[PDB]
Design a binder for this molecule. Structure first.
Ligand SMILES: Nc1ncnc2c1ncn2[C@@H]1O[C@H](COP(=O)(O)OP(=O)(O)NP(=O)(O)O)[C@@H](O)[C@H]1O
Ligand SMILES: Nc1ncnc2c1ncn2[C@@H]1O[C@H](COP(=O)(O)OP(=O)(O)NP(=O)(O)O)[C@@H](O)[C@H]1O
Ligand SMILES: Nc1ncnc2c1ncn2[C@@H]1O[C@H](COP(=O)(O)OP(=O)(O)NP(=O)(O)O)[C@@H](O)[C@H]1O
Ligand SMILES: Nc1ncnc2c1ncn2[C@@H]1O[C@H](COP(=O)(O)OP(=O)(O)NP(=O)(O)O)[C@@H](O)[C@H]1O
Ligand SMILES: [Mg+2]
Ligand SMILES: [Mg+2]
Ligand SMILES: [Mg+2]
Ligand SMILES: [Mg+2]
Ligand SMILES: [Zn+2]
Ligand SMILES: [Zn+2]
Ligand SMILES: [Zn+2]
Ligand SMILES: [Zn+2]
Lengths: 410, 410, 410, 410
């Protein structure tokens, strides 16, 4: 299943993954001109394995390779019968074979062909899926860094007009772990979204709209909630916010919103402001106090008899983070640095008492902060209603004990 | 499988799911008039996934809109032999392909040739079942909300006479989670049920009968219960009704019955009365209290050793609900807000003492309530025995301590 | 299925495996001059199984021996239709058959009848895969030793020039457990690496580069990390280092790195310095202290709060190693020499107490070293950030408290 | 399936297995001369399956069956076509059948029909595998007892020459459970082994070599071990030998060696000195003691912190042997004669106390024995280093505190 082509994918079109690009260009240089290797180039690399995560160009270096070198054929893909592949891939074979449908005589057969019946054409296997000599060099095609996000976003950005306010880095930042595909969609749906309202110029506003519709369910506004339900979910979806600021070393607050998306009643967003190299104990502790903040915000205002089963998911991740700290990253003085993840019955008790002590300490801190800053909570409950959504400039105005400015737009 | 029809029924047929309706009418307008590539990147959306629960219009929309643009095709289907037949879709298309026979390279493997041979029709592989680029848009098709229940009900309600007193919403609330087929054939069975007695005009009187039949089971009077057995159930199903009222923040009572249907001697119905997102501590404690109404009625009236295995299913639900509160949804002072749903034996016993304390507190509140209002219980036993069924207005008469009007009908 | 030929390459090819070499020259001698066995040995050695580890010369021996005795065909290999094929290979044959596609008791009476038909051919089923009379004689093909590693390295190093300063043995001990194949690769990639920069011929300077590239990841340099971040990961690696030279009986240090090579920001290499024959109590405890020494550097420099979660994989290695001592090899005075690998709940508590005592003693000792040698840590932190890599000679310079000389090259 | 030979191998080569051989010779005589039915033996055994362990002649009594009676037929060895079989078996062919090829009453049905329809051939199905009428008999083909080892050895020992001082029984005891194939090729490899050095006649000196190459890996002298490593093993293998003698009722020591063979640096051999019928408490305690000889030799000689993980495999067998005695075989005063191999936690504690006490008592005895005889340990350390191997006479020389003579040979 191989086809002769004239125009196909090159290398300069792909972005990011510079190391993978480097190994690709080495293979491309090699594919012809073997005489350059007077140092015994020595069995042109046989077998290339990409163990990268699925979805980020795991097979785009294959397309790039097939187009590259002016070798006019592609992957050979697109049981037993491989030997017919060995037979056909001897004459006029455009320098590779790529085999992704995910019994290893391929090594002996390929060696025999490349030694006897192949005039240094260097047809070798390169494969992608998710011992030395059969898979010698394995090249990782990984998820882009934020720098890479900027590049790819600019690359697909060619096709449209731009309104002045576009800042590619922020849009890149908000997509942690989005592949090339996900960015491609972000742009595409920006275009579609702008068309829906028939807007000539496309700016960052609909851009954020598209990002949101991607990660979370698209806005589902037709649902009705009573007057009081709108009010309660406004406190709980604040409180998350007023704590995100006062606790130390946290990702800053980007958005606080109230209209339901998918299965969620309200959302508070965060922006990593970098890539996750590692975490401090301090910031890990701060996360907990931000998480439970909503339930406390709901209890102080309403009474402990009316606190609702809305904090279920907020509770779960909190308890999951808590026990990881004690169990498998050190972080507890009594037990000491060890890995407890068959133990005794006494040990199973000390682990629990430590977990409870941690959550209790931060829960008290979270309770203390809200009581002192009561004016903000009422001030922020109000604006959350008058306008349905709050951006970053507005939140800072609240947190400074000042007047709220109207949101961007409206 | 291609089926050629010129014209079909309009888009008034689908009701509810307005968000899905929107995210689909964009596709509908796109299918033709692709000249709107003035955003200059508007490449066709992708295979669209409808990932709702089975049973709620997952495929209904097809006929409403496939009439639009007069596409002479349908769902294409209605172990990879397709590929060629997949590439068949280049002439007289519906501007889609639909596949609900529900490995992963199939989409992008053929999409290039698709759009290359697609006449700007916006062909996609929209699919329904229970990495962007192979599937991008996942559109929820959810169960009709209590507002949407009215819309669907009035849609299928164009085919009959109507009695003056019919109210749609009351039937709406009675069917929580009923999908479209449920409502449609509820109307259908209303029609049939009226016809069986040869009553001229349908009405709510049998409408509720149809609901009750489908939801629970046909009422079986062919059973014989002795005289002394009709009396015992009469108390149990009261007591449920007496305590459902005096306890705080409960769904209100609709009707109370004695005729045996399915496997249960008596049923007490509650009306959710306005869909609620989530519940609160007070409501859950009210439910735990009300569930134990019957056993206490039996125990006081008949003695501590004539109680029976009738509260078997009432017990299980109660102890399940009480177990969820302390383990998952916070709601206990001693243990704290944490997910307990492994652990030490000391912790294992605290949870048991906690659930026991909870059940006991509400059980005693239940007994103290029923003891004081002794007369109501007897007064209500008499009515259930005279007329085998009591409606909502009658209960107000009993609870006010005045005489009972005869039921509507009779 | 067998391949006709005339001659093959000599016996200088296979290196090491001298015991296997002998127990193969037996078959080589036997296949010819069978009458030499006047001591009635001429009961042909039946199926010979090579039961070595995979990837280390399991099937390498083909060329030398198939050439010797001038046997002209290879293995036959290259659900039992075979038996006729077993009949087929009895005249003018490879002199034996080899079959690596790995009910089975079928071998004996079949090839016995054949050898009765064989004109003293002595054909056997010599088999490879990862009772007497069918698999009586098996010849192991083990992982190469250091004195063997060096020789294989010299053999494949017949095909290029070398720069004067190459010591084979250092590269030999650098590759523990890797086969002939991995050494083949090391040389091949050395050639390529030299070619890439257009260097005339290669010393060991890039030889180590090839080792690092294969055993670890390639130098993923393209990443950026802030200045304040490198300083965090450069106080850590120095701290596996200075604590690995003040403890007794440890493997010496070779390199320390700051440039990320995969999943790790830093690497500290140790040179095994001899093949592993088992171990000693002192050496195991010293390893335990070396591992935990990294995170103590962070704790002293930045304080107990800002101690990151990068010390994770260090914790696991230590807790398994410390657990294995008191559960499998004796090494605990309280419990005694025994194998605890059910068991009571009292016995489990003692085990955790012993594991914790071990790790506590070594943790405290690894702390007592850095506090006294604070001046080394700062100095080694500077160099690691000045030049990204430190060679062995400078580490000695630092550890002696004198001025640092620049690296080889630069 | 079909093969006729007028004359084949007899049964006098069956040496061994006298008892089953008799039950077979009964049948052999009966196959013809049925006229001895004057007690109605009219009932040839319908089916007897040799239920012995695989590997010991389970197919050699069938071959004897075909040979005997001068009856011209080979047995059928060599999903139901069996009806073919009981069809064909009527051509004046008596009792010449075997089935080890690979719907349940089939054997009895066809057998009855044919033997009723056959001319008194007395046909029976005999099978080999690992209610009378389908399998009436079961005959055991067991492993050769120490008497029978002599018979098989003398049978195969005709071919070679004999050296003067070869003793069969000593080789016999050396192979505790080798089935006839193992003895046969032990002789074979004796012949081969002599041939390599090309000696005139084969003494037992090489016979020990053949046994050692079979039982454990062949000598691997190619390994190089440092000087200080040869001294370490030299002590551990002694110590095993010193405590083996001074402790009561043990299998005596045969040979003690240092050159590595397999995965073990040293091996100490014992001779069972008779068949292992059943063992007693004194003997089992002797074993538990002797095993821990090596670790104590290391600990006294070098120090309490230069011990190693070499006693890893000595520990395990010890804790198994000690665990069986308390749990399965009585042999403990406190718990009593019961099978403990579920149960309360208190009981789990008692068993560990007991196992620990047992190991402790014998360990202390082992220490006290060795310290008193310190000179023997040194004197025996020297001999192992000088000559790599010590035989039986030398151990007596050491233990009497005299001068050592050199081994046979050298
Ligand atoms: N560096 C990149 N620049 C631009 N687009 C990219 C890049 N990497 C991946 N893509 C996208 O990937 C698509 C095709 O690559 P693809 O076959 O998906 O490999 P992949 O993305 O890793 N899929 P998968 O097999 O799950 O890993 C293109 O159409 C792009 O949208
Ligand atoms: N929103 C709706 N409005 C009107 N009728 C509906 C609606 N949803 C479902 N129906 C009825 O349900 C049927 C449509 O069948 P179908 O498309 O299978 O729904 P579905 O049950 O969600 N699909 P599935 O879950 O796989 O069985 C028709 O009889 C419709 O009258
Ligand atoms: N002793 C050796 N000397 C030289 N090259 C060797 C040696 N052992 C292995 N090789 C190389 O390794 C390959 C030998 O064939 P191969 O079938 O891989 O044995 P193997 O590596 O053990 N394979 P396997 O063990 O079945 O996984 C060839 O590429 C040889 O060049
Ligand atoms: N009593 C005996 N005297 C001599 N040789 C014997 C004797 N018993 C078995 N053998 C040898 O055993 C071999 C045949 O063994 P075999 O028929 O397989 O028994 P078996 O090994 O149990 N069959 P199986 O276990 O199913 O593989 C021949 O080489 C015989 O020489
Ligand atoms: Mg891909
Ligand atoms: Mg469906
Ligand atoms: Mg192999
Ligand atoms: Mg056999
Ligand atoms: Zn929340
Ligand atoms: Zn009830
Ligand atoms: Zn570390
Ligand atoms: Zn030992």
């Amino acid at each position: 299943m191989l086809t002769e082509d004239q125009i196909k994918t090159t290398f300069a079109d792909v972005a990011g993954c510079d190391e993978a690009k480097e190994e690709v260009a080495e293979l491309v240089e090699y594919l012809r001109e073997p005489s350059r290797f007077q140092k015994l180039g020595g069995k042109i690399p046989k077998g290339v394995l990409m163990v990268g995560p699925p979805g980020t160009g795991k097979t785009l270096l294959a397309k790039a390779i097939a187009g590259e070198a002016k070798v006019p054929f592609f992957t050979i893909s697109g049981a037993s019968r491989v030997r017919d592949m060995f037979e056909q891939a001897k004459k006029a074979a455009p320098c590779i074979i790529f085999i992704d449908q995910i019994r290893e005589q391929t090594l002996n057969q390929m060696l025999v062909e490349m030694d006897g019946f192949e005039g240094n054409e260097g047809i070798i296997v390169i494969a992608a899926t998710n011992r030395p000599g059969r898979f010698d060099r394995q090249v990782v095609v990984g998820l882009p860094d934020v720098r890479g996000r900027e590049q790819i976003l600019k690359v697909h950005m060619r096709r449209v007009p731009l309104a002045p306010d576009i800042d590619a880095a922020i849009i890149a930042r908000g997509t942690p772990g989005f592949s090339g595909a996900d960015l491609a969609n972000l742009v595409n749906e920006a275009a579609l979204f702008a068309a829906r309202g028939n807007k000539r110029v496309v700016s960052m506003v609909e851009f954020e709209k598209a990002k949101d519709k991607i990660m979370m369910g698209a806005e589902r506004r037709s649902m009705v909630m009573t007057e009081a339900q709108k009010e309660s979910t406004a406190y709980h979806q604040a409180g998350h916010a007023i704590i995100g600021r006062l606790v130390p070393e946290h990702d800053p607050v980007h958005k606080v919103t109230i209209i339901p998306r998918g299965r969620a009643l309200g959302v508070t967003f965060f922006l990593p402001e970098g890539d996750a190299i590692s975490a401090s104990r301090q910031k890990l502790e701060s996360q907990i106090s931000t998480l439970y903040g909503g339930r406390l915000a709901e209890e102080i205002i309403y009474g402990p008899e009316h606190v609702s089963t809305g904090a279920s998911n907020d509770i779960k991740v909190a308890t999951n983070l808590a026990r990881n700290m004690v169990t498998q990253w050190g972080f507890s003085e009594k037990l000491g640095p060890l890995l407890y993840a068959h133990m005794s019955d006494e040990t199973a008790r000390i682990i629990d008492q430590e977990v409870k002590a941690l959550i209790e300490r931060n829960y008290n801190r979270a309770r203390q902060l809200l009581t002192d800053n009561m004016d903000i909570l009422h001030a922020m409950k109000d604006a959350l209603m008058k306008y349905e959504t709050i951006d970053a400039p507005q939140i800072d105005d609240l947190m400074a004990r000042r007047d709220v400015r109207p949101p961007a737009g409206w």
